[PDB]
Amino acid sequence: QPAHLCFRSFVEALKVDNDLVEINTPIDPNLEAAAITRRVCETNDKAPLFNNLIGMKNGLFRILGAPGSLRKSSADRYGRLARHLALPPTASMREILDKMLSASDMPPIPPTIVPTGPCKENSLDDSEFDLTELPVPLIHKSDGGKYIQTYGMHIVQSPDGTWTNWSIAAAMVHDKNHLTGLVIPPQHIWQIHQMWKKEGRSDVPWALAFGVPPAAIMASSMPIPDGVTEAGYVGAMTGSSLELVKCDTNDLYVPATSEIVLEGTLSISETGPEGPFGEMHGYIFPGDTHLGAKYKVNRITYRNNAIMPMSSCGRLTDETHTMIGSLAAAEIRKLCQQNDLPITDAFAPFESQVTWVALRVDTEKLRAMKTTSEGFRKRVGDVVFNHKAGYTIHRLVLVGDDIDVYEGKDVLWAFSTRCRPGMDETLFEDVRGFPLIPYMGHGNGPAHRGGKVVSDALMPTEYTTGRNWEAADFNQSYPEDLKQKVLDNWTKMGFS
Amino acid sequence: QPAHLCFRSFVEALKVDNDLVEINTPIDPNLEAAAITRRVCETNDKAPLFNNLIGMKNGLFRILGAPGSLRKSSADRYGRLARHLALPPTASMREILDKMLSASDMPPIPPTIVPTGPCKENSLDDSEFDLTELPVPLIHKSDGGKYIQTYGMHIVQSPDGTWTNWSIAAAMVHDKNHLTGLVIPPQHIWQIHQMWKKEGRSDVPWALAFGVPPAAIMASSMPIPDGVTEAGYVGAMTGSSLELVKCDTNDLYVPATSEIVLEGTLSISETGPEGPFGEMHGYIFPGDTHLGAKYKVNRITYRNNAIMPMSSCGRLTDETHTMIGSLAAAEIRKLCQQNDLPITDAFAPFESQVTWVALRVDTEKLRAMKTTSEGFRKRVGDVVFNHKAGYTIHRLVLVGDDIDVYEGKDVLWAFSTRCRPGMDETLFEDVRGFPLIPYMGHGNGPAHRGGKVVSDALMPTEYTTGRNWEAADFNQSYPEDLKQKVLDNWTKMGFS
Ligand SMILES: Cc1cc2c3c(c1C)C(C)(C)C[C@@H](O)N3c1c(nc(O)[nH]c1=O)N2C[C@H](O)[C@H](O)[C@H](O)COP(=O)(O)O
Ligand SMILES: Cc1cc2c3c(c1C)C(C)(C)C[C@@H](O)N3c1c(nc(O)[nH]c1=O)N2C[C@H](O)[C@H](O)[C@H](O)COP(=O)(O)O
Ligand SMILES: [K+]
Ligand SMILES: [K+]
Ligand SMILES: [Mn+2]
Ligand SMILES: [Mn+2]
């Protein structure tokens, strides 16, 4: 099976790329595996594969850390991500996001049911497993539980059967046969859970699949539209129907090659303690106490020599930056274009801790609109901040065509030099806010509302007659014939 | 003479450091010298010394570019700057700024008059020079003149004789015996020129000295207080009285070892075209047209084999970032402390194009103040934005003690995650603004007023009971004994 369609094949691909380190000596799931992975993420090192995890019971489990994190070189920086998608390892961010958006103008390709797969190689019933006995990691020293679920896919279906959602949401072990985790608006797991709670008759049939097809985990992390079944979007994106097996204890379908599958229910009534958890913005608030949703596990199925992927999330750079930020930005790009806004590109700068998105504007199109900053900012903010794709994003930065939004230094430059604080900005207080950002949930204002801004880093003539400056830089302040001479004589003269 | 007291000795020091490239083949002052220097600044390369400048007349002149720019290594990043000040080349930014502030609590050491010096080796009178015939650089392709003055020191004295100011302000060649340049509030050259215009009797006696003692050019770039003679501050800072010679045609005093000295007058009446000029924020607006102050040159004196320093300013990183930003930040630190604000450190992040200053707060002291964000922001902004040291700075970012303000990634992290847009900020519209920032002078609002903000990236408990988080990073989310094990086994395991 190809790497984008089978996690096991993805792990080989990383080895083959010289992008893996296999660690075959004993590693402790209490902090050590996550500390090594954290270090990898902070230094853009090779992904760690922990083949010898202290406490591995019943063949459960090895760990792969940093599955979607960065490589050190600029040339293949996003190569781990490209390997999720059958793209060359030198793919740009633009190319990766275009690939993730491509299925939005394609018919879905529904999945294919197969009678078995590797995820059925082993099983443990209700009398045989105990989640507290597995080598579930403690990821951060102050976490309130062992977060088994950082890179698996929750599978839930609407009561009417018409929408099956795949998404990533964190969850931790509660007891031998339950998890807890947050199920919060506007996320699709929450929208579906609300449908089941309004029906009132039963708990939500649920599965959590770990080590799924890489292309599937990418869609799981992207805010594709309400009502759209991820499996058919991934099928369209990859050009092939995904192979799924039925769960044993319910009628959901999981990827055939899933490394580990939990089957059970997500309660419509019960809650239990969750968190705190070290999170994407780089923080943990030890001691925070809160009741989350409760999941019951009835069955585990798994591959021989099963591998659990793990995100050791926090400060730059990990999956919560490379996937959450970038994939939101992609969806925001499309959303703006669909609302007739002249946006060509969008990216969530890592330097903003993926709380900003920079929107590159086609300024020829802007000029033909014959509008002003105050009107354009309001239009863009109304579109994005009232949509689920904007949920995680608190600052939008509008930039003209000279700025590469995929380059954080250029976004910073434009923001700092082209957007007058206050006057060039519109604040949005009556929109949903993201409580996870410390200034929101642990800040001075409402945790769930407001705190958003559109910052216009378009210059005045960009709305009227066109750009009226040149950069004071090597590229723009010197003619081509001189630049080339300089470059051709650089090492001759003594420079590096 | 030591490198910090003699420019010629500074150039040797750079060679000796392996921080110079001597270029002995012909280089064109029309763009080529500045293009090479621009490239150096954008890549943190060695300083270029152009020993063979096309059009060098009467021994005038060689050029040193990038005199105060960065080195490539992290270990001696600020070494060029350290060489201005007798500091080790590994000095930190903190150490450099402390050195620049040290004289603020010392008696001045007045200069010593000597009868001659190297700056008298050669002379050209009013019938012998022509500024349009010298190899003055064109620094950026769209500049409105050849900016002879980018790293010399203007010398002007109050009418009463009691204050002699040394400062850097750009100036360009107007004609064979005049320069033009901006003389604008609140700068000390402008405050002095206003005193002479109010007296109304004569033009301002003036000198411009190029290739001055490095410690002197540093003070020339720092906003030390009104009325304080830079020469006595530099004397105190260095521990020695600076040696000065009298000008021939007026009674001002110039450093004895100056490479090139212009003597003349700054008019109280006449103006002439100036600019446009590629500037510190990374822009030029070609065609901008404006009348600047006019300077008459009556005499040139110079060293044998005179060297003109040149700043090829623009996008990161050059003297306009390393000196203007950092030295303003230093003065702002002191100003805050003198106003009983608990600020321990200040720095202008390069990533903000030195338009922000990050202020590190002693949060134990803050807690004892028993105040709130809204009150503290207003207090800090009132102190800084109503003072000349705040002129160039449009955003202040308050951060707690865990943030290293000299590290732009950490400042960005704190700003993005701890300051709620709008609610955690106070806008200041009734303060002097810096028109040079594009969003000011080429923006949507008043060019000279407003556009400033204090952004509070202190978390709520930092005002009350203390920090209530830990970072989700390698340093803070793992115990010391584990961290050390990881580090000790890193290369063993296969990582880099
Ligand atoms: C890639 C990735 C995504 C997410 C998460 C993680 C990773 C690695 C964790 C490490 C587990 C940290 C966590 O905060 N986390 C997370 C989460 N969304 C949540 O509701 N809850 C979460 O706990 N997303 C984001 C969501 O996956 C996306 O917002 C997606 O759009 C949701 O799908 P849908 O609702 O649009 O179908
Ligand atoms: C280091 C340095 C400082 C300055 C400048 C440059 C360099 C290299 C130029 C390359 C020439 C670019 C230019 O914009 N420039 C510049 C300038 N101040 C001005 O009023 N005008 C200027 O044209 N400063 C800043 C001032 O030197 C400081 O603000 C100083 O504080 C002034 O001294 P004082 O008035 O406080 O005595
Ligand atoms: K999804
Ligand atoms: K000065
Ligand atoms: Mn969905
Ligand atoms: Mn001064």
Numbering used by the authors:
A (entry chain A), B (entry chain A): 4 to 499
Q: Which statements did the authors publish about this structure?
A:
The UV-visible spectra of one of the purified Arg173 variants, R173A, exhibits a modest 550-nm spectral feature that has previously been associated with the prFMNradical form of the cofactor. The 1.19 Å crystal structure of R173A co-expressed with UbiX was obtained, revealing clear additional density on the prFMN C1′, confirming that hydroxylation readily occurred at that position. This suggests that the oxidative maturation of the cofactor did complete (before hydroxylation), albeit over long time scales. In addition, there is a minor movement of residues 184–187, resulting in Leu185 moving away from the active site. These results, combined with the low levels of decarboxylase activity detectable by HPLC, and the small proportion of H/D exchange observed on styrene in the presence of R173A confirm that cofactor maturation can occur in the R173A variant. Crystal structures of the R173A variant do contain a hydroxyl adduct on the prFMN C1′, whereas a mass corresponding to prFMNiminium can also be detected for R173A, along with low levels of decarboxylase activity and H/D exchange.
Following binding of prFMNreduced and formation of holo-UbiD, the cofactor undergoes oxidation to form the catalytically relevant oxidized prFMN species. In the UbiD enzyme family, Arg173, Glu277, and Glu282 (A. niger Fdc1 numbering) form a conserved ionic network.
